[PDB]
């Protein structure tokens, strides 16, 4: 089996069905005690939670699901009727994520789309009936943060006040994205220093609020 299969099995055997908090705790225990994995983790996860609670977004897009940790984290705090769309290009990861969300009881709030973000973003309006996004969580390949942000804008998916929240802006890092948003009058940026998941290594999140053209 793979590491992601191992993590899902551990959650299924160490968490309570329909209890998202127990799911998160199980994943964090596994990844601290058994094997590291690229989930956002509890340190950065607490900062994500604080942001979600501040903005109460009605429609969130996540780029990169992995095993579903961040999707569980966000979707458990959404208000009734609010929704998360997550784009996962790796089909094996998409399948893990779906099963993680099903176990957490969050499946009705989340739609996991298996494909490349650059292919799916242009379909969001016409195929998925999206108008504009309240929040975007970036956690996919780090060289894709900037091109996909510029694509979201092109496609008319950002509105005044759309919150972008980007993982891993220090490790592995996303230097083009970070320079861009920090230099642009169309974004208001805040850096949240933290730690790499499950490690004593500095990392951070960047929040960039879109201000229009
Ligand atoms: O699209 C994907 C993968 S997106 C994963 C991006 N995320 C990361 O890489 C990521 C990495 C690190 C990290 C790694 C090593 C370190 F030493 C330190 C940090 C941490 C994070 O929090 C991350 O989010 C895909 C498609 C098709 C495929 O066949 C496939 O295998 C994969
Ligand atoms: Cl994650
Ligand atoms: Cl952590
Ligand atoms: Mg990450």
Swiss-Prot record:
Belongs to the class I-like SAM-binding methyltransferase superfamily. Cation-dependent O-methyltransferase family. GO terms for biological process: artery development; behavioral fear response; catecholamine catabolic process; catecholamine metabolic process; cellular response to cocaine; cellular response to phosphate starvation; cerebellar cortex morphogenesis; cholesterol efflux. GO terms for molecular function: catechol O-methyltransferase activity; magnesium ion binding. This is Catechol O-methyltransferase. Its cofactor is Mg(2+). GO terms for cellular component: axon; cell body; cytosol; dendrite; dendritic spine; glutamatergic synapse; membrane; postsynapse. It is an enzyme of class 2 (transferase). Binds 1 Mg(2+) ion per subunit. Residues 1-213 are extracellular. Catalyzes the O-methylation, and thereby the inactivation, of catecholamine neurotransmitters and catechol hormones. Also shortens the biological half-lives of certain neuroactive drugs, like L-DOPA, alpha-methyl DOPA and isoproterenol. The N-terminus is blocked. Substrate binds at residues 142, 168, 197. The gene is Comt. S-adenosyl-L-methionine binds at residues 40, 62, 70, 88-89, 115-118, 139. It catalyses: a catechol + S-adenosyl-L-methionine = a guaiacol + S-adenosyl-L-homocysteine + H(+); 2-hydroxyestrone + S-adenosyl-L-methionine = 2-hydroxy-3-methoxy-estrone + S-adenosyl-L-homocysteine + H(+); 4-hydroxyestrone + S-adenosyl-L-methionine = 4-methoxyestrone + S-adenosyl-L-homocysteine + H(+); 2-hydroxyestrone + S-adenosyl-L-methionine = 2-methoxyestrone + S-adenosyl-L-homocysteine + H(+). It comes from Rattus norvegicus (Rat). Keywords: Catecholamine metabolism, Cell membrane, Cytoplasm, Lipid metabolism, Magnesium, Membrane, Metal-binding, Methyltransferase, Neurotransmitter degradation, Phosphoprotein, S-adenosyl-L-methionine, Signal-anchor, Transferase, Transmembrane, Transmembrane helix. Mg(2+) binds at residues 139, 167-168. Its EC number is 2.1.1.6. It comes from the Eukaryota.
């Amino acid at each position: 089996d793979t590491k992601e299969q191992r993590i899902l099995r551990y959650v299924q055997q160490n968490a309570k069905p329909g209890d998202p908090q127990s799911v998160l705790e199980a994943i964090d225990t596994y990844c601290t005690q058994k094997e590291w994995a690229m989930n956002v983790g509890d340190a950065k996860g607490q900062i994500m939670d604080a942001v979600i609670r501040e903005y109460s977004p009605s429609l969130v897009l996540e780029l990169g699901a992995y095993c579903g940790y961040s999707a569980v984290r966000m979707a458990r705090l959404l208000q009734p009727g609010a929704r998360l769309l997550t784009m996962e290009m790796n089909p094996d990861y998409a399948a893990i994520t779906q099963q993680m969300l099903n176990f957490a009881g969050l499946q009705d709030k989340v739609t996991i789309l298996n494909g490349a973000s650059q292919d799916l973003i242009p379909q969001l309006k016409k195929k998925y009936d999206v108008d504009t996004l309240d929040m975007v969580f970036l956690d996919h390949w780090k060289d894709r943060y900037l091109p996909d942000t510029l694509l979201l804008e092109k496609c008319g998916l950002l509105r005044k006040g759309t919150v972008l929240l980007a993982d891993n802006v220090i490790v592995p890092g996303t230097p083009d994205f970070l320079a861009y948003v920090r230099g642009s009058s169309s974004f208001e940026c805040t850096h949240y220093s933290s730690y790499l998941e499950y490690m004593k290594v500095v990392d951070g999140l960047e929040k960039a609020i879109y201000q229009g053209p």
